[PDB]
Amino acid sequence: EKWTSTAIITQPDVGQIAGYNNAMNVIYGQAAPKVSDLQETLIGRFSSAFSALPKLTIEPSVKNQQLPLTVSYVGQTAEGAQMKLAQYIQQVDDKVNQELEKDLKDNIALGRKNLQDSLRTQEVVAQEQKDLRIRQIQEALQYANQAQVTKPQVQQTEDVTQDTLFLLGSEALESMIKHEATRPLVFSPNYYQTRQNLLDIEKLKFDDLDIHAYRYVMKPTLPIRRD
Amino acid sequence: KWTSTAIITQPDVGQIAGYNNAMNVIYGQAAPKVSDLQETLIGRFSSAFSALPETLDNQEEPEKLTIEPSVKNQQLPLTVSYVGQTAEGAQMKLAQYIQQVDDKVNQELEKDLKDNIALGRKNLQDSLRTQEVVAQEQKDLRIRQIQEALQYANQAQVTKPQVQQTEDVTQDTLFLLGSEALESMIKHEATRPLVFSPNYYQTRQNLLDIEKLKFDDLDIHAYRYVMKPTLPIRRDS
Amino acid sequence: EKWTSTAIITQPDVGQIAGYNNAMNVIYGQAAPKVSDLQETLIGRFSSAFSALPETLDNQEEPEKLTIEPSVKNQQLPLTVSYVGQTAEGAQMKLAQYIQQVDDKVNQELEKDLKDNIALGRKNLQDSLRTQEVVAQEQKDLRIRQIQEALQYANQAQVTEDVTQDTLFLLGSEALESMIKHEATRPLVFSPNYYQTRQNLLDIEKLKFDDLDIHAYRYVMKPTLPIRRD
Ligand SMILES: [Cl-]
Ligand SMILES: [Mg+2]
């Protein structure tokens, strides 16, 4: 005795995908895939996983149309065939959800690393620049004292450079040395952006986003008669 | 006995203009091309329709309803067919099943639009927030630099500006503005405007425009008739 | 009795399409569809219209047999159209007439499509001008606030080309007060892109359907004259 249960599935909705898509935009920004590309990626991952299970069937519902897909199972009873089809759909859904959990955490790790490497480099540079400028201020103070330049001798600010700092006068130069510790670090234009981007990536968690690789057009049927 | 046929294809750019405008407003450059939306909409209609051939067959008295491409190896247009008992009945039931699907798809589209609006808003609010944090951190750095320069201006005992010509001031040349102007910059720290990229203003306005979107305003069509359900002049075979 | 006339049609060639592709590039710029995508769009619209005729010609008092099929086993294009006539001259004549009839309906559909695309391209360029206008206003609004802040610093000492938020006060309170009157009446400053968008909108207004010689198909094989009846 043979009973066939049928279901029609298609790509998941933007609502079902919103969390993964948001996570992808937080990690990749403009380089993140379009919502429609993610939908196609997921139903493809689901279809390929179903096809490699390896009696069930997976075929396009309309000839020459990629979507939707008709899934079928031949059981011993109408209730069993329906049950087993829904179970196999859930089983595939979970395998795809697991391979999505891995890929996202790998992308988060790649994201975190590149951003921490970028911040570290910019921090080292900003400190080395502060350190050099301090040595330059220390050197300029010796020149200002020799030359008896106590008050600033600046007419145009452009005149003041890393090599003409003594023009600021020994009084202000001493103050700059005395107050070195509280002199702020100056970072490359994107530092703060990079640091905020990293904070937002750390806020991501797969458990928050309940992602689905498919959507039901028609749930598994209860066959009225046998084949 | 009697077959009623209809031919349906993707909606026209005119029929889709509203949904495409809503999509453009939500995603900007990331929005799908007009031709991709047309395929998505006929895709959503045909997918919903494909449940009916299966459901109508799994009845006590099975009904025959078909959805196939009109020309072999061509995705569009699609031929929808219904086998009825009478000519008037076959036509009536085909049009009813097309209307039934049309209603379900309109509801799916209403939910889709609000889901996309929610996603678009999240992305734009995340963008504005980030940009605001950056602009504040940049302002905060400048105030710290002014605070440091005020200590130098006081030690050098320079109260009035010391400079005639000045393009820009640096950490080392700020004290030349004098302790009087530097104190004023600190006392008014709060009212110093934040400086944002031109993208910021685009993003903020784009968020305002998303809030203006309403489903009832957009007359959306998921298909276009090539041929409405026929009235068969004679029975089959 | 029965005579079969056959024709093979396919997508329009790159020369037949040059004008429609030139109009689409005026409307969408770089966002305009690839020439091969336009070809498929035009043949798609022709074959869709044609696909009604087999059904409608059969559902007549006196049924007529017209068929559309792909000419090549696993190819979308070209398409083979067949008509069964009563006479040899008639089958061929009626096939060519039905191809012309579809060609006329599709030309009307294309005229409506061009105006729908012109409306969409208009909307996108007018939306672009409006955001550039919002940005230019927000920039003007920020500049007035920066000068207002600098005026507070100037009032704490000063009275009398490239300036910053920190060096504006050096222009003196007198000059700064004047700017709050001047810059507030000073017209908006837009990117050269703004005037270019206005130019692209002017070029869309110059588009006319009668100017572009539009073809939705191309003959591979014109309707045949059958040698002997069915
Ligand atoms: Cl002084
Ligand atoms: Mg910013």
Side-chain angles (χ1 to χ4, degrees), chain A residues 26 108 112 116 197-205:
Chain A
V26 168
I108 280 168
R112 255 193 69 193
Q116 286 171 329
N197 291 324
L198 184 56
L199 266 180
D200 298 337
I201 289 179
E202 258 146 48
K203 283 150 150 73
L204 299 169
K205 28 199 98 179

Side-chain angles (χ1 to χ4, degrees), chain A residues 151-152, chain B residues 156-162 178-180:
Chain A
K151 301 272 169 180
Chain B
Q157 298 220 291
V158 289
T159 56
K160 298 260 146 52
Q162 297 295 298
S179 60
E180 257 170 278

Side-chain angles (χ1 to χ4, degrees), chain B residues 8-226:
Chain B
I8 264 159
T9 195
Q10 66 192 357
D12 284 330
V13 180
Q15 289 175 283
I16 246 44
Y19 199 73
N20 177 72
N21 176 58
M23 287 298 108
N24 281 333
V25 168
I26 299 154
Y27 295 119
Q29 212 74 283
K33 182 64 188 164
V34 63
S35 67
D36 296 326
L37 277 158
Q38 286 178 284
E39 274 165 43
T40 291
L41 283 166
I42 191 58
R44 193 174 269 286
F45 190 85
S46 59
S47 51
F49 211 92
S50 70
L52 307 213
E54 293 288 351
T55 291
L56 289 183
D57 187 75
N58 197 53
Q59 287 185 149
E60 260 185 60
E61 202 284 334
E63 290 171 65
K64 172 78 155 174
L65 188 118
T66 323
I67 183 156
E68 287 184 282
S70 315
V71 190
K72 204 196 123 70
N73 309 329
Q74 285 229 326
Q75 294 184 66
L76 296 170
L78 303 162
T79 293
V80 286
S81 286
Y82 183 75
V83 185
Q85 278 188 264
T86 176
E88 288 282 346
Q91 181 188 63
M92 203 195 301
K93 290 211 183 191
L94 184 54
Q96 281 177 74
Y97 285 129
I98 292 171
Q99 195 53 57
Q100 196 182 104
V101 173
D102 178 81
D103 296 334
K104 184 170 178 59
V105 173
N106 197 70
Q107 287 204 91
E108 287 179 355
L109 282 170
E110 195 184 6
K111 187 229 173 201
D112 194 64
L113 177 70
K114 64 198 278 184
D115 288 345
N116 279 303
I117 281 165
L119 185 56
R121 270 159 107 172
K122 174 78 170 277
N123 295 334
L124 293 187
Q125 285 170 330
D126 281 20
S127 180
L128 295 165
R129 185 174 81 245
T130 302
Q131 288 183 262
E132 280 151 2
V133 168
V134 176
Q136 184 62 245
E137 284 168 337
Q138 284 171 348
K139 177 186 174 164
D140 286 357
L141 168 68
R142 197 38 158 203
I143 305 303
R144 280 191 312 269
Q145 294 184 313
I146 297 162
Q147 277 171 323
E148 286 312 297
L150 174 62
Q151 297 173 312
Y152 320 152
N154 286 334
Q155 213 194 280
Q157 298 220 291
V158 289
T159 56
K160 298 260 146 52
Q162 297 295 298
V163 141
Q164 303 161 43
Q165 195 178 299
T166 170
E167 280 211 287
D168 64 279
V169 279
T170 70
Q171 175 67 98
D172 305 310
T173 53
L174 268 162
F175 89 93
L176 292 169
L177 298 178
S179 60
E180 257 170 278
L182 293 170
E183 272 159 24
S184 192
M185 291 180 196
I186 287 146
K187 291 168 205 277
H188 291 294
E189 156 275 325
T191 49
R192 177 181 186 111
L194 294 174
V195 180
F196 306 101
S197 89
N199 170 82
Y200 181 77
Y201 311 117
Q202 306 186 55
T203 312
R204 195 170 70 175
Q205 188 57 47
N206 294 354
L207 189 55
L208 269 177
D209 298 338
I210 287 180
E211 260 136 55
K212 284 148 103 183
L213 298 168
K214 181 64 239 168
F215 183 77
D216 297 300
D217 278 345
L218 23 121
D219 174 52
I220 62 174
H221 310 263
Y223 66 99
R224 171 178 81 78
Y225 280 115
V226 168

